[model samples]
Target: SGAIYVGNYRVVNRHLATHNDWANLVWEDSSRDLLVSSTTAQGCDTIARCDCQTGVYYCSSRRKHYPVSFSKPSLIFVEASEYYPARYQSHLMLAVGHSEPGDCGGILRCQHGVVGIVSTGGNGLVGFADVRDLLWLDEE
Candidate 1:
């Protein structure tokens, strides 16, 4: 399987749930001693990043989105760092896996996968971009 790249790290333990109102995906990387919990649903995406060293878990980002719930919820992990601020390395990219059938607005309205990027800053969701039509050089 091709690695799903996130920021500067390769994502792991990617999980997707279907037809669920609430769900959580956890990622444990012994190499980095990092654990991530991504909970979605109820109009929010709540992410928690935990460090084994400090044994303290911190909420990296909690952002609200379209009231429309997900037919499928997914989450993955990114590497850890001490210098960068919390949520700096973590980001969420959303796309409509499949439409609800006979939906309006087509792809533009996320009825067929409008690519979106939600970036993180020191506090929470910082930057966002709609790069659905943008082209990129394949260099991996």
Candidate 2:
């Protein structure tokens, strides 16, 4: 296994490097829609990983058992600050639409201006809990 640290974030998957700006890309309106749509759908079917070398995909609910892959990996976090260095500059904030009660989808210091979101089955969103827990690690 291997790991590359970018500021406080460690990128373990080399596939991320294949993309010119995997970490630096700003979350546009389309991306935000996909995040909300795919994440709130409940079930690990949405949770998947890809092998860049083989161009293959894998899926599992138990995240630890899977590999690292993402068209856009879920929000790993970046600290809150008014000024971000060139390396960690591309980012955006996201908030739940409040379709249900107690819908405080945790907070991510990275997404929007909040810290992160907490998962509550009673309301808010269903599929996002996995995204919150996803962490891609590089394997050697």
Candidate 3:
């Protein structure tokens, strides 16, 4: 019941779904206001919950190994901005060769848990280190 230690800002601590395809988890935060760039721009989608016997994600929500891009966007987000209270911080992950920002230790998300962590790309495309067998023993 304490914080998840996502540093200064707290990370998704609930409604988590396990990704099944390549094996990982999805963090589905119910609070859309956090992900919305503008108040009127975000829509409420009835995203499905994922649970695989394979113990990771294998649904339309995300592919466990693929890098999510504008071409094949799925449910994804980072948490509250570092400048939230005072500024109108609007974006992150500038694949501005495609879209937006974040720390390298940042968590990539879906409708429920970590899909990857922030990596890099030179021409404004974000390269992420996709999450793998979080624990060899956590594997099923």
RMSD (CA, Å), each prediction = 17.0, 16.1, 15.4
Q: What is the TM-score of each candidate against the true structure?
A: 0.20, 0.16, 0.28
Off by over 4 Å in 2: 1-25, 29-102, 107-125, 129-140
Q: Which of the two candidates, 1 or 3, achieves a greater lDDT against the reference? A: 3
Q: Which candidate, 1 or 3, would have the higher TM-score against the true structure?
A: 3
lDDT of 1 by residue, 22-64 (tens): 2333443332212233333121111222211111111222211
Count of steric clashes across candidates, in order: 0, 14, 20
| TM-score of model number 1 | 0.20
Q: Least accurate stretch of 10 residues (summed lDDT) in model 1?
A: 50-59
Clashes of 1: 0
lDDT of 2 at 54: 12
Q: In model 3, which regions exceed 4 Å deviation?
A: 1-102, 132-140
From the highest lDDT down, the ranking of the candidates is 3, 1, 2
Model 3 worst lDDT run, 10 consecutive residues: 32-41
Q: What ordering of candidates by TM-score runs from best to worst?
A: 3, 1, 2
**In angstroms, what RMSD does candidate 2 have relative to the true structure?**
16.1
